[PDB]
Structure formats: C-alpha cells, structure tokens
C-alpha cells in the first residue's frame, strides 16, 4: 500500500496552497488535487492523492497532517483526514 488520500480539505483550497502547507514533501511518484466532483451538493470538500516511495515516510506523514487544521477565507475550521486510499491504482 503506497497510495494515500488526504480528504475533507476546504472546498476552495488549491493544489499549490496545499503544497505550501505540506513541505518539506517526502519522495513521491504522484500528487494530484481534486474537488467539486461530489453527488452530495452542497457538502463540498477537496482532496488529494500521493503515492509514496517508502513505507516509513507514510507513518510520518499522517503523524504530521492527520487532524491538521486548514482554514478557508471565512475562518471556518477543516480538520483533514489522512488514510490509505480505498482504491490503490495509480494514475
């Protein structure tokens, strides 16, 4: 298992802003941002997938960012969730 999702991010967060929070980034094959694709409007969230190169780096990453509070413009809190992706196939 190398593919990790970080989900329930603010709906107007961007990939670049996410990167600024995450750095220093561990070695990764893949890193892409997704949003505005749910069937459950108006419950809007953003998320990302990262495919890690080593296993020990994954434990470190969720120790650091699981529960990490992101903010949107208006100051509403968004605790992130970090888990293994339920589908492990990489794009």
């Amino acid at each position: 298992l190398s593919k990790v999702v970080i989900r329930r991010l603010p709906p107007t967060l961007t990939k670049e802003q996410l990167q600024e929070h995450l750095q220093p980034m561990p070695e990764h094959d893949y890193f892409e941002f997704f949003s505005n694709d749910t069937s459950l409007y108006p419950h809007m969230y953003a998320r990302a997938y990262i495919n890690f190169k080593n296993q020990e780096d994954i434990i470190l990453f969720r120790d650091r960012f699981d529960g990490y509070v992101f903010l949107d413009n208006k100051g509403q809190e968004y605790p992130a969730i970090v888990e293994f992706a339920p589908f492990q196939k990489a794009a």
Binding site: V5, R7, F34, N36, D37, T38, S39, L40, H43, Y45, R47, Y49, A85, P86, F87, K89, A90, A91
Partner: protein, 248 residues
C-alpha cells in the same frame, strides 16, 4: 450551458442504454480529452451516477471498461470519486440523499462486475458499512443513531449486485467472514432500547437481510439472538488468533 457539457450529459444520461453502448463508446472516444475541463466534466458526470436510470447503471460500468483502453486515467478517477462519495455519504447521512447513495453502491458493484475494481475494493467497502463511525460495543453514535438502518440497505445493495461471484475459493471465505460480522452488526441494531412491542424493529428490513443472505448461502444459519451472533464472532476470532500467533 456550454455545448460540450450538454453533449456529455446527453450521451451518458439519455442516449446510453444496453442497445446503444457501441455508438456511445465511439463518441466518447473522440471527445477532446486533452481539454482538462472536458475530461473533468465527464469524470464528474460518471460519479453523479444517480442521474442514470437504475437498470442502466451497468451500461456506464461497461462503457467505462471500453473507454479505459484509450483513457485509463479517466477510469481511475471515477473509481476514486465513487468511493469518496460512498464515504462522504456516511458522514452526511441525510435521508434526502438515500436514492443517490444507493445508486453509488450499485455502481461500485457493477464496477467490480466489469473488472474495473478487484474484490478487495468491494470487501473494504462492505466492512466500512458495518464499522465506520460504529461504536465497537454496539451503542449508538453520531453517524449511526438508533433508528438509522441504512447501513443494512447499503450492504444488501452491494451483495445483490456482485455477491454471487464470491462463491468459490478465497472470495468465498472472505464473504463468509464478512457475513459473521454483518449478523452481529444487525443484532446490535435489533438490541437497541428504542425497539419494543409498541414500536417493533421493521419487518421489511428483516426480510431484506434474510432474502439477501439465503440467495448467497442457501444453507446459512441466520442467528436468532444477539448472544448467538456474538458467539459466531468469538469462534471466528479464536481462529484468527491461532493464525496470527499472538499467544501460541
């Protein structure tokens, strides 16, 4: 509404059926997949599978299986999206979204049937229905309050869609193990204090479970009490303990 959006919407939600699958496939292939907005829109339309009639959901899985020969990334993003929606649906858990959430579960099951996901994805999802946000003593919780029986409908929806293929070998054992956990989950719900003589557990949910389980396993023992369902789980977990070597 922009022309390509109306085109994608028309192909997926109106034209697509069992008899036009080859024609829709041809057309989807020639879309401008290099335009990121267009690729994003198709992915989004497929995740929003509730717009498709229930009996033609399987045609979208089939169309996706033809399409990933030329556009594999699209299929990955749709599967990732459907699974995110199934998880978010449990976090939101408002009854106005019941039809949409069921459509998503059926779609995941059809995605297994047309080889877009392997069985591990299905079992991960079935366990999530019986464990996500569920207190391990069977007491009610924020995401699983007392009269909420929708987890049972979700499980039965997936089992009715693709469960028949888990009848041999390793998937057979995996389904048998899951059903032991499912029967306990059901007895936790049945044991809640809200259910009384004046306010009985719904018989329609009972019949849904027995019909599903007896179709998959004609000789299965349906537990007649919470105690019996806990013992089944205890016997199973003794087997696991032996395999894991935590004591012996």
């Amino acid at each position: 509404r922009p022309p390509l959006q109306e085109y994608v919407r028309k192909l997926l939600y109106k034209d697509l059926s069992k008899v036009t699958t080859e024609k829709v496939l041809r057309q989807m292939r020639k879309l401008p997949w290099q335009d990121q907005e267009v690729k994003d829109y198709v992915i989004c339309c497929m995740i929003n599978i509730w717009n498709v009639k229930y009996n033609s959901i399987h045609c979208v899985a089939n169309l996706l299986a033809g399409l990933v020969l030329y556009q594999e990334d699209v299929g990955i993003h749709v599967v990732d999206g459907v699974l995110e929606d199934i998880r978010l649906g449990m976090e939101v858990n408002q009854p106005k979204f019941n039809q949409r959430r069921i459509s998503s579960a059926k779609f995941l099951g059809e995605l297994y049937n047309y080889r877009m996901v392997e069985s591990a994805v299905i079992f991960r999802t079935l366990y999530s229905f019986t464990s996500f946000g569920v207190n391990p003593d069977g007491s009610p919780s924020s995401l699983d309050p007392p009269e909420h029986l929708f987890r049972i409908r979700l499980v039965c929806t997936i089992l009715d869609t693709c469960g028949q293929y888990f009848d041999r070998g390793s998937s057979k054992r995996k389904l048998d193990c899951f059903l032991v956990y499912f029967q306990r989950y059901v007895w936790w719900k049945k044991s809640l204090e809200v259910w009384t003589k004046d306010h009985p557990f719904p018989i329609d949910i009972d019949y849904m479970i027995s019909d599903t389980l007896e179709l998959l396993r004609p000789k299965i023992k349906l537990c007649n009490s919470l105690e019996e369902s806990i013992r089944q789980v205890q016997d199973l977990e003794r087997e696991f303990l032996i395999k894991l070597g935590l004591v012996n």
